Design an enzyme around this catalytic site. Structure first.
Site, PDB file in Angstrom:
ATOM      1  N   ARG B 228       0.854  -1.164   0.000  1.00 19.61           N
ATOM      2  CA  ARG B 228       0.000   0.000   0.000  1.00 19.61           C
ATOM      3  C   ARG B 228       0.899   1.225   0.000  1.00 19.61           C
ATOM      4  NH1 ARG B 228      -3.465  -3.077  -1.426  1.00 19.61           N
ATOM      5  NH2 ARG B 228      -5.585  -3.230  -0.537  1.00 19.61           N
ATOM      6  N   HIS B 276      -2.022  -0.339  -9.868  1.00 15.16           N
ATOM      7  CA  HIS B 276      -2.562  -1.301  -8.921  1.00 15.16           C
ATOM      8  C   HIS B 276      -3.000  -2.582  -9.641  1.00 15.16           C
ATOM      9  CE1 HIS B 276      -4.588  -1.534  -4.736  1.00 15.16           C
ATOM     10  NE2 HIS B 276      -4.274  -2.744  -5.166  1.00 15.16           N
TER      11      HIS B 276
HETATM   12  N1  LIG Z   1      -0.946  -4.399  -5.410  1.00 17.64           N
HETATM   13  C1  LIG Z   1      -1.823  -5.391  -5.507  1.00 17.64           C
HETATM   14  O1  LIG Z   1      -2.368  -5.659  -6.563  1.00 17.64           O
HETATM   15  C2  LIG Z   1      -2.134  -6.205  -4.265  1.00 17.64           C
HETATM   16  C3  LIG Z   1      -2.920  -7.329  -4.374  1.00 17.64           C
HETATM   17  C4  LIG Z   1      -3.228  -8.105  -3.241  1.00 17.64           C
HETATM   18  C5  LIG Z   1      -2.707  -7.744  -2.016  1.00 17.64           C
HETATM   19  N2  LIG Z   1      -1.950  -6.648  -1.907  1.00 17.64           N
HETATM   20  C6  LIG Z   1      -1.415  -6.250  -0.597  1.00 17.64           C
HETATM   21  O2  LIG Z   1      -0.632  -7.325  -0.075  1.00 17.64           O
HETATM   22  C7  LIG Z   1      -0.813  -7.377   1.337  1.00 17.64           C
HETATM   23  C8  LIG Z   1      -0.376  -8.706   1.933  1.00 17.64           C
HETATM   24  O3  LIG Z   1      -1.337  -9.696   1.646  1.00 17.64           O
HETATM   25  P1  LIG Z   1      -1.284 -11.119   2.340  1.00 17.64           P
HETATM   26  O4  LIG Z   1      -2.404 -11.949   1.904  1.00 17.64           O
HETATM   27  O5  LIG Z   1       0.089 -11.689   2.187  1.00 17.64           O
HETATM   28  O6  LIG Z   1      -1.418 -10.832   3.899  1.00 17.64           O
HETATM   29  P2  LIG Z   1      -1.049 -11.741   5.149  1.00 17.64           P
HETATM   30  O7  LIG Z   1      -1.210 -13.141   4.667  1.00 17.64           O
HETATM   31  O8  LIG Z   1      -1.874 -11.272   6.346  1.00 17.64           O
HETATM   32  O9  LIG Z   1       0.503 -11.488   5.371  1.00 17.64           O
HETATM   33  C9  LIG Z   1       0.957 -10.270   5.904  1.00 17.64           C
HETATM   34  C10 LIG Z   1       2.411 -10.414   6.289  1.00 17.64           C
HETATM   35  O10 LIG Z   1       2.821  -9.133   6.754  1.00 17.64           O
HETATM   36  C11 LIG Z   1       3.403  -9.276   8.053  1.00 17.64           C
HETATM   37  N3  LIG Z   1       3.245  -8.090   8.903  1.00 17.64           N
HETATM   38  C12 LIG Z   1       2.072  -7.468   9.217  1.00 17.64           C
HETATM   39  N4  LIG Z   1       2.238  -6.445  10.016  1.00 17.64           N
HETATM   40  C13 LIG Z   1       3.601  -6.418  10.253  1.00 17.64           C
HETATM   41  C14 LIG Z   1       4.403  -5.577  11.054  1.00 17.64           C
HETATM   42  N5  LIG Z   1       3.869  -4.547  11.756  1.00 17.64           N
HETATM   43  N6  LIG Z   1       5.732  -5.802  11.082  1.00 17.64           N
HETATM   44  C15 LIG Z   1       6.238  -6.829  10.382  1.00 17.64           C
HETATM   45  N7  LIG Z   1       5.567  -7.676   9.597  1.00 17.64           N
HETATM   46  C16 LIG Z   1       4.235  -7.433   9.576  1.00 17.64           C
HETATM   47  C17 LIG Z   1       2.746 -10.510   8.639  1.00 17.64           C
HETATM   48  O11 LIG Z   1       3.506 -11.036   9.721  1.00 17.64           O
HETATM   49  P3  LIG Z   1       3.071 -12.390  10.449  1.00 17.64           P
HETATM   50  O12 LIG Z   1       3.353 -13.568   9.504  1.00 17.64           O
HETATM   51  O13 LIG Z   1       3.911 -12.502  11.731  1.00 17.64           O
HETATM   52  O14 LIG Z   1       1.562 -12.315  10.730  1.00 17.64           O
HETATM   53  C18 LIG Z   1       2.670 -11.403   7.434  1.00 17.64           C
HETATM   54  O15 LIG Z   1       3.938 -12.070   7.266  1.00 17.64           O
HETATM   55  C19 LIG Z   1      -2.288  -7.002   1.489  1.00 17.64           C
HETATM   56  O16 LIG Z   1      -2.630  -6.546   2.825  1.00 17.64           O
HETATM   57  C20 LIG Z   1      -2.510  -5.925   0.430  1.00 17.64           C
HETATM   58  O17 LIG Z   1      -2.301  -4.651   1.040  1.00 17.64           O
HETATM   59  C21 LIG Z   1      -1.646  -5.901  -2.989  1.00 17.64           C
END
Ligand SMILES: NC(=O)c1ccc[n+]([C@@H]2O[C@H](COP(=O)([O-])OP(=O)(O)OC[C@H]3O[C@@H](n4cnc5c(N)ncnc54)[C@H](OP(=O)(O)O)[C@@H]3O)[C@@H](O)[C@H]2O)c1
Ligand SMILES: NC(=O)c1ccc[n+]([C@@H]2O[C@H](COP(=O)([O-])OP(=O)(O)OC[C@H]3O[C@@H](n4cnc5c(N)ncnc54)[C@H](OP(=O)(O)O)[C@@H]3O)[C@@H](O)[C@H]2O)c1
Lengths: 316, 313
Positions: B228, B276
C-alpha cells in the site's frame, strides 16, 4: 528557409500583471520566442503553434491559424471550455503540486477557523462578552470535501492528518488512505446528512451549477458550516442566506462569487455569519507555474507530447 | 429466502462480469447488485460480497450476518466497517498467491536485467551494453511473509536470488533468510539490493519506510511497492532517488488512486508507475472460493475465518 515556431502570450490582465508574467515565462523558457499577442504582425501570428493564456479574448486566439495547443495559467477552465471549445485545440489547465499544497493548507486553515469558533469569539469580543464555548474533538467531527481532484484530494489528506473524520465526494470512485470516499449523484444527500463542516473544491460545470441548492443545504445537520473555495454558482446564494438566517447553517467562508470583485451591495459583506475572502485561498504561484509551462513546452519541442487536456464533453 | 448483495464501486461492466462468475459459482443463490434491491429486499440480505463498497450501503443491510471481500487487502474495510461488528472475510486464494509471486519475480527481473536503463538508452539512441552479475550475487528482501509474501520469497529463491524475508513473527522458509520483529528490520535492509514490499497497511506499518529506514538500504538499492502507498514515505523516496541513494522504484500502490496528475511519480525518470495491477483478483478462482464458503455457511452455519479488528490485518 523553414520558419521556426513561436509562442503568443494572450491575456486580458493589466499591462503590469502581463509584464510580470512575461518576465517569469521568459526566464522559464529561455530558448523560446514569446510575445504579447498585440505585438505580433499578421505574418508572425501565422508562426504561433502554442498560446499561453490568461483570460484571453477568444477572437485573438481565432487569429492564430496554425495554433496547435493552448496552456492556461489557472486550474479553473469553465470560461475556456465555453469560449474556446469550438476551436477544437487541446486546452491544458494548470496542474501544480505547489497549488495543491497551498489549497490543501487553505482548506485546513479555514476549517480550523470555523471549527475553533473564531467567528463567534470575534462577535463576543466586539460585544465585550467573555464566554467559553464547548469544544468537541476532530475525531468526532465529520468534515466533507466535495471534489477529490488535484486540489480536493490534497485537502482531504491534510484534514485527515489533523484528525477529522473526513468524507470525500467525487463523480467516479476514489481510494484515499484514511478517508471515506463516496461517488455519484446517488450518494451526495446521504453524505451531507453527516457533515458538520463542508468544503467545496468542485469545478463549475453544467452538472455542478446549483448543486448546493435549498434541498441539498437542507440535508446538512443543524449548525453545519460551509467553506466555498470552488466557484460561486455551485452554491445558491439566496438559499444560503435563508439557511443562515433560519439558524440551520452556522457560518459560511466564501472565497468565490458570481461577480468578482464582489459588488458593494452584496448582502455577504455585512452578514454576521459570512466571512468574505477575495479569491485568495490558492493563488497561482508564477514561479512554479512558469516552470511547469516551461517543462510542458520543452517536452512538446522534444517529442511532440501535448500535456493532458480538458475533456470538453465532461467540461473540466 | 435469504439473499446476497453484491456491493461494489467497480465499473458496470466489471461488476456484471463479477456477477456472472458469482452466479455460476453459486447457482442456488439470489445475488443482486445493492442498487437493484428495494428496501424490503435489503432486509432479506444475510451476506454481502464486496469490492470497495460504500460503507453507508452496508449500513442499510439491517440483517447482515457476514461480509466476503473479493480482495486480500482489508484496511478500509477494517476502518469503515469495523463498527458494524460483522465478520469480515478477506480473499485468500492460491491463484492470487501465484499471481503476486509471479509479479514479484517479473518486476525484480525488470530491475535486475536493467530494463529501465536500456529504455533510457533507447530514447537517447545510445547502444551500450551494461555489466551482468548472477542472481546468486544479488540480495532481494521481501517485507511480509504471508500468503503473498512467502509465495514471492519462494519464486525469487528458485530464480537463484539470495533472498531475505521479514515478518512480525519467526518463520522458517527453506533457502530463505528470515528475520522477525522491529528490532531486525534495519539490519536486514542494510543487506538488500532489491526490496519488495508485501505488507498490509496498519497503524504499525504506516510510514515504515521513512527517511531513516530508506537510508539503511545500500547505495543504488531499488524498491518495488506492491503493498500500500502509505507504507512508503513519498517525500523521503523522492529525496533518496534524487540523491542517487535509491536507483529506481516500481510503484503499484499510492495514497490516492487514481494517482493524481500532479504526483511527481508520473514524470520522475527513476520511477515506474503501475495502476494497482501486480496481483488482480481472478474472478474464476475467487468466485469458486466465495462459493465454497457460502455453501458451507448454508449447509452448517459456518462463517469462514475473519479479520481480527484489533490486529488490523
Ligand atoms: N498491489 C496489488 O495488486 C495487491 C494485491 C493483493 C494484495 N496486496 C497487498 O498485499 C498485502 C499482503 O497480503 P497477504 O495476503 O500476504 O497478507 P497476510 O497473509 O496477512 O501477510 C501479511 C504479512 O505481513 C506481516 N506483517 C504485518 N504487520 C507487520 C508488522 N507490523 N511488522 C512486520 N511484519 C508485519 C505478517 O507477519 P506475520 O506472519 O507474523 O503475521 C505477514 O507475514 C495485502 O494486505 C494488500 O495490502 C496488494
Ligand atoms: N478559490 C481559489 O483560489 C481556487 C484556486 C484554484 C482552483 N479553484 C477551483 O477548484 C476547482 C478544482 O480544481 P482541481 O484542479 O482540483 O480540479 P480537478 O482535478 O479536475 O478535480 C475536480 C474534482 O471534482 C469532481 N467532480 C466534477 N464534476 C463532478 C460531479 N458532477 N459530481 C461529483 N464530483 C464531480 C471530480 O470527480 P472525478 O475525480 O471523478 O473526475 C474531481 O474529483 C477548480 O475547477 C476551480 O474552480 C479555486
Amino acid at each position: 528557409f523553414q520558419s521556426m515556431s513561436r509562442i503568443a502570450l494572450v491575456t486580458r490582465l493589466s499591462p503590469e500583471a502581463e509584464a510580470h508574467w512575461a518576465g517569469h515565462l521568459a526566464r522559464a523558457l529561455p530558448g523560446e520566442r514569446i510575445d504579447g499577442f498585440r505585438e505580433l504582425s499578421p505574418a508572425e501570428r501565422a508562426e504561433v503553434d502554442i498560446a499561453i493564456v490568461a483570460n484571453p479574448d477568444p477572437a485573438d486566439l481565432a487569429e492564430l491559424p496554425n495554433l496547435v495547443w493552448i496552456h492556461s495559467l489557472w486550474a479553473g477552465v469553465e470560461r475556456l471550455v465555453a469560449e474556446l471549445g469550438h476551436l477544437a485545440r487541446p486546452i491544458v489547465r494548470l496542474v501544480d503540486p505547489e497549488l495543491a499544497r497551498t489549497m490543501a493548507e487553505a482548506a485546513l486553515a479555514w476549517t480550523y477557523y470555523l471549527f475553533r469558533d473564531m467567528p463567534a469569539y470575534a462577535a463576543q469580543q466586539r460585544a465585550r462578552v467573555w464566554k467559553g464555548l464547548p469544544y468537541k474533538r476532530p475525531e468526532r467531527t465529520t468534515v466533507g470535501v466535495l471534489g477529490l481532484g488535484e486540489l480536493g484530494a490534497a485537502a482531504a489528506l491534510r484534514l485527515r492528518d489533523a484528525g477529522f473524520d473526513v468524507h470525500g465526494w467525487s463523480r467516479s470512485p476514489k481510494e484515499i488512505a484514511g478517508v471515506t470516499c463516496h461517488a455519484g449523484e446517488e450518494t451526495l444527500e446521504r453524505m451531507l446528512g453527516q457533515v458538520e463542516i463542508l468544503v467545496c473544491l468542485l469545478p463549475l460545470t453544467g452538472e455542478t451549477r446549483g448543486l448546493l441548492d435549498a434541498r441539498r443545504l437542507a440535508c446538512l445537520p443543524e449548525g453545519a458550516q460551509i467553506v466555498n473555495f470552488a466557484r460561486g454558482p455551485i452554491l445558491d446564494s439566496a438559499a444560503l442566506i435563508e439557511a443562515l438566517d433560519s439558524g440551520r447553517i452556522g457560518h459560511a467562508v466564501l472565497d468565490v462569487f458570481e461577480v468578482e470583485p464582489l459588488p458593494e451591495a452584496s448582502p455577504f459583506w455585512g452578514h454576521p455569519k459570512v466571512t468574505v475572502l477575495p479569491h485568495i485561498s490558492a493563488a497561482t504561484d508564477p514561479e512554479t507555474a512558469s516552470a511547469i509551462v516551461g517543462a510542458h513546452v520543452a517536452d512538446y519541442r522534444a517529442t511532440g507530447r501535448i500535456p493532458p487536456s480538458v475533456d470538453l464533453t465532461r467540461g473540466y
